[model samples]
Target: RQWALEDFEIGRPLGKGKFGNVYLAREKQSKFILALKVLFKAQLEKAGVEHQLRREVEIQSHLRHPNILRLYGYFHDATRVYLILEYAPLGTVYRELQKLSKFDEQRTATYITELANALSYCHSKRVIHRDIKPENLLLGSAGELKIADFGWSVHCGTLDYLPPEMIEGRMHDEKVDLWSLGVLCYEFLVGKPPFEANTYQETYKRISRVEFTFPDFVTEGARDLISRLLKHNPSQRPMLREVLEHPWITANSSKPS
Candidate 1:
């Protein structure tokens, strides 16, 4: 059945962000919980991202994977658009990182494995998730990771996660995700982004120069995997399948079902 605003029993606010806020909602008839993402039409128009929103919905709705958040359906009113999304009660990976400072090898490896699996599915479908960061990831009730945001799937992404080709305004492909995966892995283990600097231009310079160092605490297996993924030449980056088979992932990650 199709959804409408009236069909949901809106509860407390889940969170607030740039465009709008998310609310805990339930389908009255089925009693199924969902996260209702409310976006203001005026705001979307102001940002000139109406097309981006459409593409995000299109890509996310078609993707079906355990590690990807579900876009159940959507509805709109005159002023706002509502997206029915899978309720991730555990909140975002960003929040978890803020609490823990940084993750252990086991947790980082598991999340990286899950992300690799999800990205593999996306690449198979010709969908490139350009943005892969802790803020864009959510955790399910069972502590499984979910790729939560797709706004940048069809376009560019965050500065820290941007690959060298993207920074250089050159042609890019799915390998952009591989670069972000490496950045995420480093962030998970080191507590900060690899190329992060005091200024935006400095950060860009670091990214373009591919300048970053690993902490002594980082394991050899993880350092090798990150180095392979973060190669400046896109062709040099390992495929998602190869990432899954990397020693760090295979040894430290939990067994996949």
Candidate 2:
């Protein structure tokens, strides 16, 4: 059945940002709780995901990851699409940053390590999440992080957030997620992206030159890890499997609250 605006009674707020609005919903009689991600096909099309709409649902419905957001199913009519998904009530890590000045190094490292594990597994299955950022990484009510949004995902990082090589019309790989993961780790440490820009040309410039790096307040090992993943040369970027094995994630991963 298709969802209508009047069909839901909010149990709690979910999240908001570029993904539109998400709400924690439950079936009236069955008592089934699910994360209902309300999205507009028009908005997604404008965002350039029109072609990959089914692909996103297909991938989410088939795959499983302890640190990947779950997609139970989807129902669509003409006006809207409702994805019945695993609810992450703590919301995005991006929101968490808004609530705190900065994340502790150990906490950031732990999330990064878990993210790498999830993304690496996706790559093994030949899927790459082209968009991996704080806004897409969510925290469940129990406080676990999971990567979401595969609509912009490609076999490699062709669009969404890309690596230098792909932007230059060269071949690339799943390392693109690692590159983004690096940027994500940096955000966790600093509360913002290093390559913030007002235009596409400027954003590409920052990505092409590896122009940004560890700001002063970040930890040493964290800086070292970012340096490795944020390289302009895609081949030089560390593989996701090797990331957790690195000194940064290995020595610093801390238990979540």
Candidate 3:
């Protein structure tokens, strides 16, 4: 049967974003919990991003991976669109990172391994997740990480995670995800992005020059992996498989169940 708004019992609002608000919902017949992301069709047309929205839906709905958030289905009424998504009750990693300031090596490595696995799956399907920051990640009830958003697959990410090729306006590919992963790793351990600065220009300069310093606390293996991934040239960055096999990851990463 086709899903409709009446089929689910909607609950509290989950969160808000540029496109719309998300609400906690449960399918009445199956008792399955889900997130209902509501977007206004009028605003989507006004913003002229209807194509972008469609692309996001097409890509995300087709992906099947444990670490990738599931887009169960979608339905629309006269005025709005509703996306039925798997609920990640623990919320976003960005919120948790903000509270903790930084994560310990084990947690960071586990997350990186999970993300690398997810990204590898994504790339295998020929999809590029341009944005791979903490905010786009969600934690499930079991504390496992899930990549939640696909809006940036057809877009540029936040400034701090942008790769040198992106910053220089050069053509980029899946390797950009690798660079963002490197930035995420540094941010996870150091409590801030590696090339962040007082001004956007300075930050861009640092990114283009591939200039950044690690704190005294960073381990050599971790530093080595970050350096390998953060190369200015995209071709020089290690493949996702190589990243999965890196010494730091092999030592600290939790095996996927």
Candidate 4:
């Protein structure tokens, strides 16, 4: 079915960004609510990112998971492109995490559990979400976590979460996501990434050395899990299945299987 701009009743602006703007909208005929992301073709072309947009749409449209935002459909005008997406009423996880500094054990564990499951699914499909930062995650009103951006994702990988092999100029795999999982968990617990430093060079040095600290505030169980995930050798990193079953994640769950 063809989508026309007028077919959508645009509501409040959800957000504005360098790429474009996202607005709350409703399908006039079906009365279904969604988020509409509008991108300017000229800006994309000017920035030499037309290919990036194409790849982003291709990857996101094919991905279907409860924890991955849905890309319903897309259409374009002479100068712009529109992406129809599932609305996440709670906005972004980054803002929520910032508001609290850090989350409690149960809350962080719950989020990690869901993310582990989602990342595992992505790996199964041969997709590597190279960027797994907090800003890239969105939360639903129901407290569901959804990966909302694939801009930095590749069928391959990237630097911050790059495994030791990749940094040393070797090929890598889904284990890269596992390493990022560790970094993300640490940030959730301590309010900053484990390898964060004053400068990009310093951060890279820390990540290359896999050097980090577990503040006295982080629990023993959480430390164990993060350590297992951030191993220098990708082969040594715990598989996502093992992470999903870690004690910290399963501890306060309603159903412990």
lDDT of 4 at 85: 96
Q: TM-scores of the models, in the given order?
A: 0.95, 0.84, 0.94, 0.91
Candidate 2 residue-wise lDDT, 1-257, digit = tens: 65554555567666664646778898675677778877788888887875577777887777788788998777766877777788776778878899996798888888887787777678778787775767777887778798877643555322325667767778777767888888888878887777777777777788777677566778778888888888887788877767878877887887421
What digit string (tens of lDDT, one per residue) describes model 3 on residues 1-257? 68989999999999988889999999999999999999999999998988888988998988999899999999999999999999999999899889999999889999999999998888877888875778889999998999998744643334788888887989898899899889999999999999989888788899999999999999999899999999999999999999998888988987652
lDDT leaderboard ranking:
3, 1, 4, 2
Residue-level lDDT for 238 in candidate 4? 89
Better candidate by lDDT, 2 or 3: 3
Top lDDT prediction, candidate number:
3
What is the Cα-based TM-score of model 4?
A: 0.91
| Model 4 Cα lDDT, one tens digit per residue, 61-138 | 888988899999999999999999999999887898879999888878878887888888887777877648788789
lDDT at 127 for candidate 1?
86
Instruction: Report the number of the highest-TM-score candidate.
Output: 1
lDDT of 4 at 59: 88
User: After superposition, which runs of candidate 3 have C-alpha atoms over 4 Å from their true positions?
Assistant: 151-157
Root-mean-square deviation per candidate: 1.6, 3.7, 1.8, 2.5
**Candidate 2 has what TM-score?**
0.84
Prediction 1 TM-score vs. true: 0.95
